[PDB]
Amino acid sequence: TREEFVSFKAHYGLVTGLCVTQPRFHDKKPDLKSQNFMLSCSDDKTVKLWSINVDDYSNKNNEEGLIRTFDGESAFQGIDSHRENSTFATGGAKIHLWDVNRLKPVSDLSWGADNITSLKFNQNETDILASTGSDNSIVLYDLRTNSPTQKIVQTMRTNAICWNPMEAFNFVTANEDHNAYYYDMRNLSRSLNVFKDHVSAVMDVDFSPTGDEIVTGSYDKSIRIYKTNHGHSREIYHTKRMQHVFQVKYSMDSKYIISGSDDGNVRLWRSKAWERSNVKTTREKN
Amino acid sequence: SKTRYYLEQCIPEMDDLVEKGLFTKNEVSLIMKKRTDFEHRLNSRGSSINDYIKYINYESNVNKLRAKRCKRILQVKKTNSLSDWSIQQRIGFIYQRGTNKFPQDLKFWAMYLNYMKARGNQTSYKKIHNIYNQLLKLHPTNVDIWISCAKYEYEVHANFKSCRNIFQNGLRFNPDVPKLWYEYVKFELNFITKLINRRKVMGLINALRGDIALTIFDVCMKTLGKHYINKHKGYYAISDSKMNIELNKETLNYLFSESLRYIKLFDEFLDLERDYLINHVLQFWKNDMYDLSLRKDLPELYLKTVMIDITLNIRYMPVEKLDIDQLQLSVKKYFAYISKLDSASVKSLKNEYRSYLQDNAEDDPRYKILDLII
Amino acid sequence: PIEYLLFEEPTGYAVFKVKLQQDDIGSRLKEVQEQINDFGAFTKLIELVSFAPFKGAAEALENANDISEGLVSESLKAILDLNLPKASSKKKNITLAISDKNLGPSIKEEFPYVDCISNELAQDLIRGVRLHGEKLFKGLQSGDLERAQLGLGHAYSRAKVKFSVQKNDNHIIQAIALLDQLDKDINTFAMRVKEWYGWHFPELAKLVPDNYTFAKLVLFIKDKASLNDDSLHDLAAGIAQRVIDNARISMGQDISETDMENVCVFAQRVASLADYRRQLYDYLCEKMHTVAPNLSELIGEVIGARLISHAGSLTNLSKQAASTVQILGAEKKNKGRISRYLANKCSMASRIDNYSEEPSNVFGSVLKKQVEQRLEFY
Amino acid sequence: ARIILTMGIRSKASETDLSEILPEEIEERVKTAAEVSMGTEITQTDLDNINALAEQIVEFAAYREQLSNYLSARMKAIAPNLTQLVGELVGARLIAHSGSLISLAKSPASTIQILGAEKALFRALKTKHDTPKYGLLYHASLVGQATGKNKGKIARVLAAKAAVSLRYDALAEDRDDSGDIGLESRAKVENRLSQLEGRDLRTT
Amino acid sequence: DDNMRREVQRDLLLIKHRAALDPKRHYKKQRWEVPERFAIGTIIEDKSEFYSSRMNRKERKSTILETLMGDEASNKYFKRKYNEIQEKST
Amino acid sequence: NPKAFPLADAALTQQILDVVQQAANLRQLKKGANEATKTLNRGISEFIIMAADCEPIEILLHLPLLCEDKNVPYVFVPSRVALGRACGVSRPVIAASITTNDASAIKTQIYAVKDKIETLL
Amino acid sequence: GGAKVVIEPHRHAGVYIARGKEDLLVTKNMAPGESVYGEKRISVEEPVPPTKVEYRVWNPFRSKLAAGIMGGLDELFIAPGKKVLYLGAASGTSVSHVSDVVGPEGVVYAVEFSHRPGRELISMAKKRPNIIPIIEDARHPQKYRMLIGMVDCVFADVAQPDQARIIALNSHMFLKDQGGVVISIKANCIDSTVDAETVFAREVQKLREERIKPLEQLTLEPYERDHCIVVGRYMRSGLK
RNA sequence: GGAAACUCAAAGAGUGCUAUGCGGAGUGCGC
């Protein structure tokens, strides 16, 4: 319908990270179908795990916001969640791993004294994750050994990681030199593709869920969508009202591109910009 | 045009069927001509089931000619080519297309079913169960669907568990038709005599009486009365004296006519306690539903109930010497009923007279008892 | 993930499988909201897989009541557990698309292996299948939907409002508008019997003037051959004896006896019509004693039926004010103010025996005593 | 009236009818309309009252049919050549507009051509316009069988032969009650009609 | 058509000329050419409507032209205005 | 829900009776059942008041079927003699109706009473 | 009350003008030989054996649709082919005229919540075939979804201050696409505090946020104070 | 010069129309 379920004034300062969760408490069947949980870490040294009374099912007929709060001694910058066992991870002045059952960081994880600008879990081999620090550095962590496991330093600062849903050991870094880098994981010395055609800092990126077409949104007022095995722009989307587009993500059916800008608005786009989204008779399909 | 897709789907079987020497191209082009016309008439607009029927008939006939020239020219039963399964699998494909396009007519549904039964040597009840399932879902109300399904999977598979399941399902979907209740009781006594004589076979070579039929008869009478009284008085329950009483006695009339049908084709079963179950039927018919059929109104039904109560013990044959031994209960019942009824005394007397006239040196004491009854 | 939907129709329930899923993000687009108006591209979404009609119209009204109160009925239970596949433990919970969040939890309780969806997408393809309707079934039904919901609508309205079956002036208005007309035409036909039998008895018409006794004795004496008795003639009735003498002294008469039998059948036809009258009149005397007993006791059955006919209906007569109970002919200065008194008394009586659901007579009696004590000034 | 006289309450309609009253494809309409019927219910008292009116309508219809047979037999007794020629209903309507049989016997055949279209004739005189050509006589079978304006022509010749036969059996004193010259004039107008339906003004 | 147009050929022209039929109305301006499909017809009265706007039995003139001929005060207005028009036009 | 359903409690009864009294003194009130239904189908009726102890009750119960058709609010009060004293007249009235008038001095009190009785129903 | 008046077809099909000295507005009756409401009927005679057919006078002081008609609407959606969902059908005041301007072929699903006007409505409804009486509350169209199918115009004479939610829910459930919407708005029953066209602006904006595009409005001022007839169409796809 | 059709030709709009995708088994796994 293109409107919100609910909205909240979450934190005092900026919100710097938020994800969604299917939590598991040890004292509840967590009903992940009548209500829906997100969470967010922010600038005011707090992480908040939040409920949403969603209306998609009709199994029932109330506990709207802020089911619990986590408190950290320094600020926070990034969030993502291990997509099993309700363990999520935050980038702040140091990267902390914690689950939703205890109000303390279950692990410190950093290399040394450098903040963690973003991070992202994996979609498969979910125990592994990556992060990007303001040392212009990519650091991979493995939570089985509960340890960081390799770091590379690049020239300019990596804005945002996103893993591959299909390849599962390839990710994409978007950094501030004006190109995104399709890295491997097992051989981190050759960034096995470079998607080049931008003019300013590339703010985030994610894959299509079909795993072969990625989308970068950059600090110039334009997003663009890349094929995986080319390295140049398949297509450029821009409009006059969008400006300094910061967070672009790919909807879970590989059809729409959600672009949240800096002027406030969040927009929908098609991925294949010429196709249309109705069912087609087989002569049209052919 | 998907007709081109079907028409060049059918090319490789005729390719192999020509390159082995049973047809020539000068006539496989003719059958391709007629197949082209049939496919066009089929998936054109405004088509019909008769077009599907003629396509099925033509493909079965060219299948039979294929087998005929196979055993004539090649002198074998089959040539293990692609064709031998292909022609009947596309017959089944035509059947599937016709059921999807026209799920109305049970004639085409039924001959799909009959062809799959006759192929049932090779093919599967895994395939049969699916088409019975979707036919059952498209027609829940039609009772012959459930009856033919039960007849098939009890008179080939004999799976009494599934037959009980689908009869309970059919009565769940419509507990209104008398025929489904009737044939549920028919299957019940069928397998009850089957396993009585099965344990008789076990007893030869080496509890479960009609209480099930009693229970389903009782719920049959209750549900049938509820559904007749709801079939009448369509939208609004009419509230007066005489129309309310007439509707209750009309329901009782139709219900007890149905229990009379239950009795009169219940006595076909001889391998069970037929008299005890007919006694249970009359005992359930004794106490009434807001009408009191015996002493109050429906006196003709009370008279037929009394005559059935006498004849349920008087069920005998021409060789009636054991009836001459055990007709004391008959004379006692006729006396105790003539001592109750007023003009049904005359009716029951004439009825027992005609029944004894149907019953009639061994004729000599029988003539004595005949003068006693007269 | 919308695998099945349940559509509730006047003739019975239908359950559709969903072949292709509609698009979820672009659901407010023109090219998606037009494919639920194109039928040949709506059938690429939705396949009919079951349709159980209601057995009787009483069960149709019962299912309409149970859906309107959001309950599950037994035919609905039957079609749901026939069509919906049983799932495993919690993986792949099967999914209906129903039309209301109140029918949601009830079938969730009846089927814990079934999940119910009623969002914009569910209501979208629900209204698609409602729009196309009977074209989906391709004749697989016994019923036409507009006339079926006509009957179901009047039934559901009547059962919701508890509209009475006896409290009904529609008998009485056409009953009185029937009997005045047939009084007129039996007068016509008796005059025609009179002028026809004047060719056989030109003298009897002045001696026996009454219509019913006239026709009943015309059925008695066919030809002028009475000649002997007075007993049966007085039983049809001295005047008998004068008619007997004038049958042989009048003689200003033809015979036409070979086809006077049509006059014999015609006079008894007038007899049967005039005897259907007074038993219709007895019927509506009882019907005004049962429907509007205060009106029948205050003003009488004839003026009561004329009043509710001349007003149009009983409720219209009641909701009429006391001054607009003016009429012509009925309500039999010193007559004017007592006519006004009787007028607003009978309007009040009409209000009583209309809006009372099962009226009594005692208030009609006290109104009668009031108006007679009022006119007793004279 | 017969279907209410058989039926009574629409509740009974699912189990009692017979298709001599009406064709069989309408009986299923009657039973389906009985179960989807939006009507109320009534009692046995008003049911038998309208049942009595139903049989009243049936009896009056049967009386009307026997009166028509009565009229046929009696006009065949009165003016047998006339009803041999024209028809009993139209002959009775002509005598009804006439008065007595001799009172239209003393009439020109022009009047018997126009003895029904009175105000149309007189208004088509009044305004200087064109007269009608049928009168009441249009409902006779012969002028029905004629097609065109030759039906007006046969209306004229049937008026003439009707005047002949009419005053024959009016002022006869011993005629045979058989319609002999009425039948003769019928054959005359019939062969007249065929030999003017042979005519067609369009060429061949 | 032109078979009853003789009977109704006046009244549609005066309904076109309603603007001056009575000097107390001033119907709003429209031309109202004679339409292709129309039908005459009379009001019938509500049975509760009585003493108020029902016209009597011998008062029911069977044409609108005859009903307009009825009241001689209206015809008097017609007479005086046509007379002043005639003397001012001669 | 017996027959005269929207029956006012004590405080609302008293404020509608005092607005009845000042309406009657302002000559904005028409009293009695048939004058009430006459002004109801004239169309000038702001809300109507009916005394639900009348002899019997149907003589005014004809009025809901007109008033809820024509969308005016209707209240019952518990006493005819209370309504008569509040109308300022010697005999017990049972029905009363406030004629609509924009030249009234009681217009805001009328509207407050109307809002309270419409929330009552 | 006995004079003779000519008939003429209006712009909208189904409704007729009766031009006499004064000129009425009228409709062709479904049930001849009767007057339901208390209106005057004009009876004409069609000349085959001759028929006698009657026409009920539509009172614009008693039905807001007839107020809007002779106040002048550019188009309705009550055509003599269509089907009409009458929200808030009180009585046989206006629903009879909407019924017989629809005609013998199409249905008017009239709804109503109150019980006394409901029972006289069904007693009206037995005498003409094409209307369907509903005795449900209009706030829950789910509890009468069983029995109305895909109506192609809605009329709304409901007078309670959640009109926008009423018409939104009913039009989403039953009104077909590109279908008609006709609203009668009563400012004193929506809210008496603020003025009439302010609440008209509020309700027009609530319509076009419920994607009923409003084409036309009318104040109907010489007949009733402070109502507005808003005609719009359900766009549902491409509001722009 | 105006008017009949199954006279034909050419465009347009509306209503429809579905417009419409090795095998029996047996043998161990797949909850």
At E22, list the tokens.
């009575």
Question: What are the angstrom distances between the C-alpha of A105 and each of A94, A108, B76, B162, F12?
Answer: 11, 7, 81, 59, 63
Gap between the Cα atoms of A172 and A212, Å rounded: 12
If you write DSSP's letter for every residue of D139-182 in order, what string do you get? GSHHHHH--SSHHHHHHHHHHHHHHHHHHHHHH-SS--SS-HHH
- In the structure, do chain G and chain C come into contact, i.e. share 3 or more CB pairs under 8 Å? yes
Cβ of B2 near strand H (under 7 Å)? The reply is yes
Which residue in D has a C-alpha nearest to residue C179's C-alpha?
D53
Judge contact between C132 and G108, C-beta under 8 A: no
Gap between the Cα atoms of B237 and C355, Å rounded: 23
Judge contact between D105 and D166, C-beta under 8 A: yes
A47: Cβ–Cβ under 8 A, 6 or more apart, which residues? A39, A40, A41, A69, A70, A71, A72, A76, A79, A90
Judge contact between C97 and C16, C-beta under 8 A: no
For tokens 């470079």, the residue is A194
Gap between the Cα atoms of B85 and C117, Å rounded: 45
Chain C residues inside the 8 Å CB shell of E48: 311-312, 320, 324, 326
Reduced to 3 states, what is the DSSP secondary structure of residue B204? helix
Residue C52 bridge partners (DSSP)? C13
Gap between the Cα atoms of C158 and B227, Å rounded: 22
CB neighbours of residue C189 within 10 Å: 19
- Packed helices B328-338 and B299-313: angle between N→C axes, nearest 10 degrees: 160
C189: Cβ–Cβ under 8 A, 6 or more apart, which residues? C266, C269, C270, C273
Residue G56 bridge partners (DSSP)? G27, G41
Gap between the Cα atoms of C207 and C242, Å rounded: 8
At C46, list the tokens.
């939705």
Residue A42 bridge partners (DSSP)? A15
> Which H helix or E strand runs over B41?
helix B25-42
Judge contact between C116 and A59, C-beta under 8 A: yes
Gap between the Cα atoms of A161 and A151, Å rounded: 14
- In the structure, do chain B and chain E come into contact, i.e. share 3 or more CB pairs under 8 Å? no
Judge contact between G198 and G172, C-beta under 8 A: no
Nearest to C105 by CA among C116, C94, C97: C116
Reduced to 3 states, what is the DSSP secondary structure of residue G52? strand
Q: For residue F56, is the peptide bond before it cis, meaning its omega torsion is within 30 degrees of 0?
A: yes
Question: What are the angstrom distances between the C-alpha of G46 and each of A210, B48, B197, B200, E41?
Answer: 74, 47, 83, 87, 10
As a whole number of Å, the CA-based R_g of chain A is: 19
Gap between the Cα atoms of A13 and A105, Å rounded: 22
Backbone angles phi, psi at G212, to 5 degrees: -100, 105
Judge contact between A194 and A205, C-beta under 8 A: no
Instruction: Please tell me what DSSP assigns to residue E35.
Output: P
**Parallel, antiparallel, or unpaired for β G108-111 and G84-87?**
parallel
| Secondary-structure percent of chain A, ordered helix, strand, coil, rounded to 5 | 0, 45, 55
At B86, list the tokens.
């292909």
**Parallel, antiparallel, or unpaired for β C12-18 and A87-92?**
unpaired
At C264, list the tokens.
């014999």
Q: In this structure, which amino acid lies at residue D22?
A: L
Cα-Cα-Cα-Cα torsion C120, C126, C130, C132, nearest 10 degrees, comes to 100
Reduced to 3 states, what is the DSSP secondary structure of residue A90? strand
Gap between the Cα atoms of G154 and G234, Å rounded: 10
Gap between the Cα atoms of G123 and G133, Å rounded: 10
Judge contact between C277 and C182, C-beta under 8 A: yes
CB neighbours of residue C168 within 10 Å: 18
Instruction: Please tell me what DSSP assigns to residue C6.
Output: E
Gap between the Cα atoms of F100 and F105, Å rounded: 12
Resolution at which this structure was determined, Å: 3.8
> C149: alpha, beta or left, given left = phi > 0 and alpha = psi -120 to 50?
alpha
Nearest to A191 by CA among A145, A240, A152: A152
Gap between the Cα atoms of D45 and D158, Å rounded: 56
Nearest to C25 by CA among A134, A255, F82, F58: A255
Angstroms from B369 CA to nearest CA on chain C: 54
CA G169, G170, G171, G174 dihedral sign is positive
Q: Which of residues 223-282 of A touch strand H (CB under 7 A)?
A: 281-282
Judge contact between A160 and A205, C-beta under 8 A: yes
CA G88, G90, C68, C129 dihedral sign is negative
Nearest to D136 by CA among D150, D120, D115, D157: D115
CA of B40 to C1' of H6 (A): 29
CB nearest to B232's CB, from D11, D37, D44: D11
> Which H helix or E strand runs over C87?
none
Gap between the Cα atoms of E34 and E16, Å rounded: 8
Gap between the Cα atoms of B43 and B20, Å rounded: 31
Angstroms from C283 CA to nearest CA on chain F: 27
CB neighbours of residue B205 within 10 Å: 6
- In the structure, do chain C and chain E come into contact, i.e. share 3 or more CB pairs under 8 Å? yes
Gap between the Cα atoms of A239 and A27, Å rounded: 49
Residue A89 bridge partners (DSSP)? A80, A97
Judge contact between G180 and G231, C-beta under 8 A: yes
Judge contact between A97 and A87, C-beta under 8 A: yes
Burial of A7: CB neighbours in 10 Å, binned 0-12, 13-18, 19+: exposed
Judge contact between G96 and G55, C-beta under 8 A: no
Angle at A111 between CA A109 and CA A117, to 5 degrees: 75
Number of Cα atoms under 13 Å in the Cβ half of residue E62: 1
Burial of B164: CB neighbours in 10 Å, binned 0-12, 13-18, 19+: middle
Judge contact between G112 and G89, C-beta under 8 A: yes
Which residue in E has a C-alpha nearest to residue C324's C-alpha?
E48
Which residue ranges make up each domain of chain F?
1-121
Burial of A127: CB neighbours in 10 Å, binned 0-12, 13-18, 19+: middle
Reduced to 3 states, what is the DSSP secondary structure of residue G240? coil
At C245, list the tokens.
């003498």
Gap between the Cα atoms of G95 and C363, Å rounded: 36
How many residues in total does chain E contain? 90
B254: Cβ–Cβ under 8 A, 6 or more apart, which residues? B228
| CB pair distance less than 8 Å for C70 and G132 | no
Q: Cα D164 to the chain's mean position, in Å?
A: 22
Long-range contacts of D67-71 (CB under 8 A, 24+ apart): D67/C262, D70/C259, D70/C262
At C354, list the tokens.
């209309």
Residue G51 bridge partners (DSSP)? G46
Question: What are the angstrom distances between the C-alpha of A187 and each of A52, A127, A147, A150, G221?
Answer: 41, 19, 19, 11, 82
Judge contact between B329 and B313, C-beta under 8 A: yes
> G14: alpha, beta or left, given left = phi > 0 and alpha = psi -120 to 50?
left
Which residue in C has a C-alpha nearest to residue E51's C-alpha?
C326
**Partner F, chain G 62-91, Cβ-Cβ below 8 Å:** 90-91
| CB pair distance less than 8 Å for F68 and G93 | no
At E23, list the tokens.
């000097």
At B348, list the tokens.
């029951």
**Parallel, antiparallel, or unpaired for β A223-227 and A213-218?**
antiparallel
Question: What are the angstrom distances between the C-alpha of G20 and each of C84, C158, E15, E70, G68?
Answer: 67, 42, 7, 16, 21
Backbone angles phi, psi at G39, to 5 degrees: -85, 170
Residue A205 bridge partners (DSSP)? A216
Angle at F72 between CA F67 and CA F77, to 5 degrees: 80
Reduced to 3 states, what is the DSSP secondary structure of residue F76? strand
Gap between the Cα atoms of G110 and G125, Å rounded: 10
Judge contact between A90 and A78, C-beta under 8 A: yes
CA B93, B95, B97, B103 dihedral sign is negative
How many residues in total does chain C contain? 378
Nearest to F41 by CA among F3, F71, F10: F71
For tokens 């999914």, the residue is C95
Question: What are the angstrom distances between the C-alpha of D106 and each of A121, D114, D159, D170, G122?
Answer: 121, 15, 14, 10, 64
Sheet holding A233-237, edge to edge: A202-207, A213-218, A223-227, A233-237
3-state SS, one letter per residue, for B43-88: CCCCCCHHHHHHHHHHHHHHHHHHHHHHHHHHCCCCCCCCHHHHHH
Judge contact between A223 and A216, C-beta under 8 A: yes
Gap between the Cα atoms of B184 and B175, Å rounded: 12
- Packed helices C336-355 and C362-375: angle between N→C axes, nearest 10 degrees: 170
Burial of C103: CB neighbours in 10 Å, binned 0-12, 13-18, 19+: buried
Cα-Cα-Cα-Cα torsion C270, C271, C277, C283, nearest 10 degrees, comes to -140
| Structure determined by | cryo-EM
Question: What are the angstrom distances between the C-alpha of B206 and each of B200, B201, B203, B271, G74?
Answer: 10, 8, 6, 21, 96
Q: Where are the alpha helices (DSSP H) in chain C?
A: 30-33, 57-68, 74-83, 103-110, 120-132, 145-161, 170-197, 204-207, 211-218, 231-236, 239-249, 261-276, 279-290, 293-299, 301-311, 314-319, 336-355, 362-375
Question: What are the angstrom distances between the C-alpha of C149 and each of B366, C54, C60?
Answer: 69, 13, 10
CATH number belonging to domain F1-121: 3.30.1330.30
F50: Cβ–Cβ under 8 A, 6 or more apart, which residues? F4, F60, F61, F63, F74, F75, F76, F77, F94, F95, F96
Gap between the Cα atoms of C305 and C361, Å rounded: 17
| CB pair distance less than 8 Å for D56 and C57 | no
Best of C3, C24, C109 to mutate (most A CBs within 10 Å, chain A): C24
Q: In this structure, which amino acid lies at residue G21?
A: K
| Secondary-structure percent of chain G, ordered helix, strand, coil, rounded to 5 | 25, 30, 45
Q: In this structure, which amino acid lies at residue E9?
A: Q
CA of C91 to C1' of H28 (A): 26
| CB pair distance less than 8 Å for F68 and G117 | yes
CB neighbours of residue G231 within 10 Å: 21
Q: Where are the alpha helices (DSSP H) in chain G?
A: 64-71, 95-102, 115-125, 163-174, 187-190, 196-209
Nearest to D44 by CA among B250, B244, B229, C177: B244
> Which H helix or E strand runs over A173?
strand A170-175
At G103, list the tokens.
């005609």
Separation of first and last alpha carbons in chain G = 51
At A49, list the tokens.
């795990």
CB neighbours of residue B216 within 10 Å: 18
Q: Where are the alpha helices (DSSP H) in C69-210?
A: 74-83, 103-110, 120-132, 145-161, 170-197, 204-207
Number of Cα atoms under 13 Å in the Cβ half of residue A206: 22
CB nearest to B230's CB, from C56, C138, C165: C56
At E84, list the tokens.
């002043």
